[PDB]
Amino acid sequence: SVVSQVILQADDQLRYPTSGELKGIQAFLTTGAQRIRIAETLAENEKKIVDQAQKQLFKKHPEYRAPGGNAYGQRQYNQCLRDYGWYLRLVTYGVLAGNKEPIETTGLIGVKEMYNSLNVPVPGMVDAVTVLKDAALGLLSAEDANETAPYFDYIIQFMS
Amino acid sequence: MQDAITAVINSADVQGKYLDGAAMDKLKSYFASGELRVRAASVISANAATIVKEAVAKSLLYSDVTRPGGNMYTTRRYAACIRDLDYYLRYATYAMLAGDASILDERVLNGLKETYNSLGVPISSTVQAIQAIKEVTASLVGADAGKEMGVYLDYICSGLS
Amino acid sequence: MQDAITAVINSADVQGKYLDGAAMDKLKSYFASGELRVRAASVISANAATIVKEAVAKSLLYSDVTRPGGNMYTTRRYAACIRDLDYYLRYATYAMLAGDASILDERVLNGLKETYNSLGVPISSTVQAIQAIKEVTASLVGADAGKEMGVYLDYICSGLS
Amino acid sequence: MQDAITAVINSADVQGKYLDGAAMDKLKSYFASGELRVRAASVISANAATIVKEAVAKSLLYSDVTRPGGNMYTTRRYAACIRDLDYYLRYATYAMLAGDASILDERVLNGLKETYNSLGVPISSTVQAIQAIKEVTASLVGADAGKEMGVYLDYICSGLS
Amino acid sequence: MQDAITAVINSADVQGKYLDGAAMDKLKSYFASGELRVRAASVISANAATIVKEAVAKSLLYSDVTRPGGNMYTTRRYAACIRDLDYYLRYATYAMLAGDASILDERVLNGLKETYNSLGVPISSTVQAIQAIKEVTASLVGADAGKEMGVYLDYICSGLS
Amino acid sequence: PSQVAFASGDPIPQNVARRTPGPSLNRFKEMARQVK
Amino acid sequence: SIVTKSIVNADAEARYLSPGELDRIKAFVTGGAARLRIAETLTGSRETIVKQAGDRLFQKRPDIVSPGGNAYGEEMTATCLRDMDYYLRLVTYGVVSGDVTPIEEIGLVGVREMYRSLGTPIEAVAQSVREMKEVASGLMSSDDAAEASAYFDFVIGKMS
Amino acid sequence: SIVTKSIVNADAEARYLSPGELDRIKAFVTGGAARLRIAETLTGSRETIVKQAGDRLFQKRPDIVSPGGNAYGEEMTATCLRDMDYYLRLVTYGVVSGDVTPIEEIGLVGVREMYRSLGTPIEAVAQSVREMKEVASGLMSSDDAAEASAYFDFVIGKMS
Amino acid sequence: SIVTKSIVNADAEARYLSPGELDRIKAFVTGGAARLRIAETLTGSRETIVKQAGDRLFQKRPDIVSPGGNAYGEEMTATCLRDMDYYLRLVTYGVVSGDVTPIEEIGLVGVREMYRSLGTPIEAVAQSVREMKEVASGLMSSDDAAEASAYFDFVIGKMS
Amino acid sequence: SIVTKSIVNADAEARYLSPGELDRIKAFVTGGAARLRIAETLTGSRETIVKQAGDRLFQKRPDIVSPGGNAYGEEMTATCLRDMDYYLRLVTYGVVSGDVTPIEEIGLVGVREMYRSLGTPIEAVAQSVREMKEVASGLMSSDDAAEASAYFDFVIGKMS
Amino acid sequence: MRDAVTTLIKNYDLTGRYLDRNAMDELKAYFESGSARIAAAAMINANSATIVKRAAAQLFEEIPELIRPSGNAYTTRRFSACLRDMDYYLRYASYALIAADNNVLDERVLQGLRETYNSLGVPIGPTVRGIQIMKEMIEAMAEDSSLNSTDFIASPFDHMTRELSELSV
Amino acid sequence: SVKASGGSSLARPQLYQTVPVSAISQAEQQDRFLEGSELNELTAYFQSG
Ligand SMILES: *[C@@H](C)[C@H]1/C(=C/c2[nH]c(/C=C3N=C(/C=C4\NC(=O)C(CC)=C4C)C(C)=C\3CCC(=O)O)c(CCC(=O)O)c2C)NC(=O)[C@@H]1C
Ligand SMILES: *[C@H](C)[C@H]1/C(=C/c2[nH]c(/C=C3N=C(/C=C4\NC(=O)C(CC)=C4C)C(C)=C\3CCC(=O)O)c(CCC(=O)O)c2C)NC(=O)[C@@H]1C
Ligand SMILES: *[C@H](C)[C@H]1/C(=C/c2[nH]c(/C=C3N=C(/C=C4\NC(=O)C(CC)=C4C)C(C)=C\3CCC(=O)O)c(CCC(=O)O)c2C)NC(=O)[C@@H]1C
Ligand SMILES: *[C@H](C)[C@H]1/C(=C/c2[nH]c(/C=C3N=C(/C=C4\NC(=O)C(CC)=C4C)C(C)=C\3CCC(=O)O)c(CCC(=O)O)c2C)NC(=O)[C@@H]1C
Ligand SMILES: *[C@H](C)[C@H]1/C(=C/c2[nH]c(/C=C3N=C(/C=C4\NC(=O)C(CC)=C4C)C(C)=C\3CCC(=O)O)c(CCC(=O)O)c2C)NC(=O)[C@@H]1C
Ligand SMILES: *[C@H](C)[C@H]1/C(=C/c2[nH]c(/C=C3N=C(/C=C4\NC(=O)C(CC)=C4C)C(C)=C\3CCC(=O)O)c(CCC(=O)O)c2C)NC(=O)[C@@H]1C
Numbered sequence A: 001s002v003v004s005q006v007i008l009q010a011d012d013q014l015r016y017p018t019s020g021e022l023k024g025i026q027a028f029l030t031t032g033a034q035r036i037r038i039a040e041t042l043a044e045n046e047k048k049i050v051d052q053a054q055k056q057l058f059k060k061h062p063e064y065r066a067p068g069g070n071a072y073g074q075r076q077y078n079q080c081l082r083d084y085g086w087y088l089r090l091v092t093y094g095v096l097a098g099n100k101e102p103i104e105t106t107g108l109i110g111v112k113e114m115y116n117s118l119n120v121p122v123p124g125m126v127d128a129v130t131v132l133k134d135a136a137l138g139l140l141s142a143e144d145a146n147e148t149a150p151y152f153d154y155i156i157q158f159m160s
Numbered sequence B, C, D, E: 001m002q003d004a005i006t007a008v009i010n011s012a013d014v015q016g017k018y019l020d021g022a023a024m025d026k027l028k029s030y031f032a033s034g035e036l037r038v039r040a041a042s043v044i045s046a047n048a049a050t051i052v053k054e055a056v057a058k059s060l061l062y063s064d065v066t067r068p069g070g071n072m073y074t075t076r077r078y079a080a081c082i083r084d085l086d087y088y089l090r091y092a093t094y095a096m097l098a099g100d101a102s103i104l105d106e107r108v109l110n111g112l113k114e115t116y117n118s119l120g121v122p123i124s125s126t127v128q129a130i131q132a133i134k135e136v137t138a139s140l141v142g143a144d145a146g147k148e149m150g151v152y153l154d155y156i157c158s159g160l161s
Numbered sequence F: 001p002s003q004v005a006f007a008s009g010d011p012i013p014q015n016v017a018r019r020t021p022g023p024s025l026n027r028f029k030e031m032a033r034q035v036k
Numbered sequence G, H, I, J: 001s002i003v004t005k006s007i008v009n010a011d012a013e014a015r016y017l018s019p020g021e022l023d024r025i026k027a028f029v030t031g032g033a034a035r036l037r038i039a040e041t042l043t044g045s046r047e048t049i050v051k052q053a054g055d056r057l058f059q060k061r062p063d064i065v066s067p068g069g070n071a072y073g074e075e076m077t078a079t080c081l082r083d084m085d086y087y088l089r090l091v092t093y094g095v096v097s098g099d100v101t102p103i104e105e106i107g108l109v110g111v112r113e114m115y116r117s118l119g120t121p122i123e124a125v126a127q128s129v130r131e132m133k134e135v136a137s138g139l140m141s142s143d144d145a146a147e148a149s150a151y152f153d154f155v156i157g158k159m160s
Numbered sequence K: 001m002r003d004a005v006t007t008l009i010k011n012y013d014l015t016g017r018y019l020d021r022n023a024m025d026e027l028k029a030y031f032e033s034g035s036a037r038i039a040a041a042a043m044i045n046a047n048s049a050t051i052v053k054r055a056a057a058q059l060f061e062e063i064p065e066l067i068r069p070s071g072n073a074y075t076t077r078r079f080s081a082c083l084r085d086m087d088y089y090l091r092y093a094s095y096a097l098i099a100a101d102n103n104v105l106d107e108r109v110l111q112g113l114r115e116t117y118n119s120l121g122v123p124i125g126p127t128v129r130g131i132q133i134m135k136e137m138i139e140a141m142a143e144d145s146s147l148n149s150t151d152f153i154a155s156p157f158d159h160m161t162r163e164l165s166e167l168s169v
Numbered sequence L: 001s002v003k004a005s006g007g008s009s010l011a012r013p014q015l016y017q018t019v020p021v022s023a024i025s026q027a028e029q030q031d032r033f034l035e036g037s038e039l040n041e042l043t044a045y046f047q048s049g
């Protein structure tokens, strides 16, 4: 969390946490209620988002279902849906935490070579995360979309 | 030295292209500011000596700097301090006319700290003298052109920092 | 580094001959002055911070340098100046105990002028601070040990200048 | 500066002896290899503009260095680069005539590195230009004369690097 | 560092064409001379100590360099000079097997003038030392292989001079 | 035993092309075409 | 500054700016008006804070102004008031900047050995900062008093 | 520019700007719209002035495009037209700045040494810029083409 | 010497010399008459120890002067006795300094690689300094022989 | 001790002790009897030395026994006299050992943190040790007090 | 590393002055521009990879000799190094847009860039050409998007262009 | 512009590795002559060249 980042900076510089970062924890505690609301609505309405994202990706990129790809079987189809569900799940996790560090410890560090070893295209997945962003921000309300957009946006940035 | 027009021309020439619309906009903005810059330069050029007089009376006079044992004590050092404040006022007028601090980088701040440290010139006292020049010029010209002059006077101070 | 003993040994060694009587008189003078050097170094090591305190109070306090815009304005830069004076006093005691100014030219001076020029440190004012250190040390320790310390303090000043 | 003969004379002088047999053999080697140096210097003095023109065509023309933004862009910078290459070719001819690269240290390489780093001159681009000079003069002047010219131009490149 | 193959292939890649008529000749000369250069380097690596043994016996011993007051007087300075001649022999073998002096430019000649002029090493004396190494290797490994070593050895001499 | 001389031997002359205007001057090249 | 810390923390991990530190930056921006109000109050009342705090300090600790004290004499008393004015100006800088980094960089590094070389009791200077905190807390509202006393207590911690 | 030239002259005389110099700068900033209209005219007709002037130069001095000439061939002709366009851009910069200093710092100092290194006929480049002046005066009005022709004639005088 | 060593150690520890070194410096200063007496005795008899030690070494080890030996030759023997005079001079330097640091900095570091690049037997050089030690102990009194012979067999132990 | 730090230096240089160092051990052994009778004399006079030190401290700096001082009360003055007696015992250990290593490794590393935590006036403790110096030089002979005053000056310099 | 509030504090601290009405006006201007700066930086984070790809494509079609032999975008190693340099420029431009100060650009971009590019032969003209191409495409994208204030976006790129650029006149 | 310069010394990055550069640098970083390993390296490469 941002509390964890502030407390690690305090332990790094060998002193108690300071005024501005304590106001940062206070601002986090004020916005945590709407963060919990975002987590609740995304968890209850994840299914339409993952379905719309998978049809949008697989009509934008006609090569994984085509010969010469990697998503032929239903087990690979369910694996791609599982990757979508885990990515949206980790985004809700980081929205609850207030920042990126749970996603960095769960689904970011080593993701490029992780999918190079499994031959899944990284630009294909940045297109996947952008169309999943389009689905989620279309489903979610306006200032809520503005609040939750930089988490997805950092996901596309860290992927590529 | 570079003014605003020469800075735009230098940027476009290193780009290698002709002047696009952003160059037109920056040139028109400089021409909009130019009449205020010329009026301020004319007023400062008329009142060149009185600004230095008021700044010296405000900041340096009747102090340990001008008392015996001070670096403004001996009258050749006093006249040198007067000429230094004329330098700062004239080059700040140049920088305000140009819309740029390039002349301050090339001719004023070039080795000035080493020069003053070799001479024994008081750095914070001449910083307060330039500050007094800034206040007198802001009182004498106005808020807008005084602020514009104070930008380059603070640039001279931060170079002396 | 070289003390007086290593200095006369290397001076004999470069021309390759043994110790003569005139080289032995150098050791006679050094062993005559050795216990004076020992007691002077003991006194200065006892009162190391006190000399720097009275030197800054005598020369540098209430001058331009501590005022805002000066080189000793911030507390970090004041602590750095106190650190530099501690360096100068400790290495001057080292050179006084060695009886040869090799440690000063090897570890204090060969690279300090351009460092101070890059930092903007006033060399004339820190030379005056070292002179204040010399005056306070000569008051504290005595005449002969005071001028013996002052020889290497002037060596530091000459290396800085 | 010194040539091979002057280097032999200075070495024997600081040794304090007359010319022994090895010095005579080195002198005989230089006296044998002098005529090819003479005719090589005649050829280079004949075509001295042509190596510079052709090598600039070999390495620097229609590239980023002469393109807008590059360091050889404007006509004053082009003339400065042509002047620098003329200096390199003339001093390499001098070093080839002397049979020693001491003139390159005394005249060329004593301040050229810091001069170019102050000027912002691309040392890599000058290295490619001097290698082009080397290739053109090796095509023009012969095999062993081209080898000697390449040795002194690689000395210029090693001084730049 | 880079070798002859890298120099050829970089020239070809900068030109953007294939290996048409002269790159093939350079590479076939390189691959032809390679095995005998490897044999020569094998002999030099086997007899590396003895080359500097009678090289220093022929060049530097029984001189004022080795006498008191000389730069090769003490045992530490002697061992450092022996290690430097070993460095010169090893990097000359490196440049011979590479077919280019880029290893000498990148690991030897980049700071050799700096360290020798700062320390006080006699340039003429170490040039005579590398010349002694050249004639010793020419005697010990053959005339043509010794000359192939000697072109890089007197490249190092020209870099020193 | 005489074939060791790679660097000591006769150096081989090189075929380096003189640098030509590239595609940064495409408009000037087609301008020269249509002017002729 | 807060913006300085966020950009530095992003650049140390070589990424762009994360959503958590962007939220902390916009919290800093929204609190800028309140911080400017607090700093304007302090710089408007800068003379009476120094006057009243110096009076309370010299009444509570008469030893430092007694003969043999460090601040005995008119010039030393004026220099002590100048030091209190310096620290009040640093407090205004910290309130403007939103954290304690200008205070720490300008006037809290080497203060211990600085005042040790001066011969000045560092706990008495901390008491002077405490009286400045009390006067400044009395001259504003409660939340503004807490916000300014955060920086004041940072100066207390670094000087004691 | 005229401002930099006046500042350089007043600095060499160690004085402020003259009232006549200030009146010239006022006239310059009022005529800014007209001179930037000349600038946009030249950028509109950049490819036609060089075209007609190169045609006139090639029909006037056919030794330029003859075999053995400096500009013999397609690519050398293209380089000659590129140098022509460079000088047109420098004239545009000069009429914008109101001074010949941006012209002369880029394309007139060392031009003789550059063109004797390249073998190029300097008087033929001067004739090329003369033809550019005539084409610009053709597709420009009277007084403004006289204004641009002042800077063009400076190029002619400093080159030839 | 011990002065140089103590000053260098205190400079490494960034502190003044403690009185536990100051008493050492003043006692080493007061006890210098014996060391200068040893040094003047050695430099008064300096050639005689070289003569006797060379005679005893060439008697004890005939293979030094044998054909095929390292010192086979007139200038070989001359430089051999010159090295013996060198090491006697270094012993007098160590006696003067009261420490073995001049002997280390002149003629102990690199001795092994030096004599391998000379071909000279290091154990025979050690034997030479040994016969130096017995000749000096024969011609100078007992405790004086102990003080000089300590430096002598330190040189022997550094050789072999 | 000086012998154990000579062992430390010889182990750091990976060698046996130099003959100068054995001469230092010689001088240490010969001065041991005089240093031991110095230590015996002052530990015989260990009581009145600290009583007069406490009374002289009370006359020098009277705010310690005043209300508001650290040593207000009979048990507080008893603990102050106990601390002074313990520092006197450290002077005994230093004079016995021959170096300032026992004072450094018992009661001089962390003395600043110790007395800053305790609130003790460190300059007043330095004044107490200075009064101990005065009364010790009063009841001690000239060379003996000169030998003890070097260790006393080390205590003053490192503690004050 | 200094932002606008930090450099204003340093400028006033050098003179030993309290924050006057001009200083509070500058701080108010920064704090009212800060929302637009944050929105612009979030936009920069959004289209960063696509903007560096299309800016590199526009640069290499404007100056085609870079991707040809003897150019410094020739190999894919040189190509990826150029993309990394352009991404570095965009990242520090985002940092300077948030900070409202070019001191981050001075401290961390420009103080050794001429030295590195002259050491490795990397051109300094197409570099600032690509930087300005990034500036034009980002300014056009911000004009397309719902950004009320877009005047501050050109300042870090123009500072990079002026500081890294060579003095032609 | 920039107010200081660290100096632009010439940098020579290795564009690609060839096996003579590999063996020579391999023993050069280990501060030794090419022993029999690097000799067999260059021998096999010069035979296949
Ligand atoms: C005989 C060669 C001459 C001589 C030489 C001499 N050299 C040194 C010391 C040094 N030499 C170097 C040089 C290099 N180190 C490297 O790694 C390389 C590239 C492979 C080179 C060229 C250096 C760095 C030193 C100093 C430290 C070291 O030993 O490496 C000395 C000693 C100087 C001293 O006083 O300590 C000497 C004497 N001296 C002569 O008289 C011959 C002409
Ligand atoms: C008296 C004969 C006339 C006169 C005097 C007057 N002087 C001043 C102010 C200053 N004069 C000096 C001059 C010197 N400083 C030096 O060190 C020396 C030589 C040793 C000289 C001559 C200075 C420095 C001042 C400034 C005072 C200060 O210390 O700051 C004034 C005051 C002007 C004002 O407006 O304050 C006056 C009135 N005036 C006359 O009418 C007499 C002819
Ligand atoms: C055309 C009117 C005549 C002509 C021209 C010609 N020029 C060149 C080569 C070059 N000209 C320049 C000049 C400039 N560069 C600048 O940046 C400026 C100021 C803006 C000027 C004036 C340069 C640098 C070159 C070198 C080419 C390059 O950029 O790499 C040529 C080519 C000659 C060759 O390639 O060897 C020609 C043909 N020649 C004529 O006969 C016309 C009279
Ligand atoms: C040409 C190969 C490349 C290059 C050259 C270039 N050099 C300069 C400017 C200067 N060069 C020198 C160097 C010297 N000083 C000496 O004493 C000698 C001979 C022993 C030399 C060679 C100096 C002093 C200057 C400064 C001249 C001046 O004040 O203008 C420039 C000009 C840079 C400018 O800003 O004007 C250039 C372009 N740069 C390249 O890109 C070519 C590859
Ligand atoms: C007052 C709260 C206490 C105190 C003060 C006191 N201070 C001094 C002298 C100096 N203090 C400083 C410190 C600073 N300079 C700076 O620029 C800053 C940060 C902005 C600080 C903290 C300095 C430099 C001095 C020296 C004066 C000079 O300008 O040269 C004194 C005088 C000591 C003397 O012997 O002269 C005093 C008395 N003393 C107290 O008892 C109060 C607790
Ligand atoms: C004699 C005890 C043994 C012996 C000697 C021998 N030495 C040499 C040659 C040299 N020895 C040195 C040694 C030093 N010079 C110094 O300045 C110092 C430090 C003080 C030392 C240790 C040197 C430099 C030489 C070279 C001669 C010169 O001065 O230039 C030789 C000659 C070997 C040769 O090949 O010429 C000999 C024979 N040999 C023995 O067997 C005895 C054990």
Ligand SMILES: *[C@H](C)[C@H]1/C(=C/c2[nH]c(/C=C3N=C(/C=C4\NC(=O)C(CC)=C4C)C(C)=C\3CCC(=O)O)c(CCC(=O)O)c2C)NC(=O)[C@@H]1C
Binding pocket: K057, K060, K067, K074, K075, K076, K077, K079
């Ligand atoms: C598709 C069947 C073929 C193809 C087309 C294509 N290539 C590019 C652009 C580039 N090609 C490269 C390739 C290389 N770099 C190297 O160092 C090597 C040798 C190993 C190669 C082959 C690069 C770096 C580029 C980008 C630079 C450029 O624009 O030239 C394009 C253009 C893409 C665009 O305009 O955005 C196209 C259409 N490449 C293939 O490999 C197939 C043969």
Ligand SMILES: *[C@H](C)[C@H]1/C(=C/c2[nH]c(/C=C3N=C(/C=C4\NC(=O)C(CC)=C4C)C(C)=C\3CCC(=O)O)c(CCC(=O)O)c2C)NC(=O)[C@@H]1C
Binding pocket: K066, K071, K072, K073, K077, K078, K079, K081, K082, K083, K085, K086, K088, K108, K109, K113, K116, K120, K122, K123, K126, K127, K130, L013
């Ligand atoms: C792309 C716009 C241009 C280009 C780029 C290019 N750069 C390099 C190599 C380096 N670039 C840097 C620069 C930086 N280091 C930093 O830390 C920062 C700021 C955060 C910068 C801007 C450095 C240090 C290098 C060297 C090693 C590295 O890549 O880190 C290359 C490679 C050249 C080579 O041969 O190795 C290239 C190609 N080249 C162009 O032509 C474009 C104009």
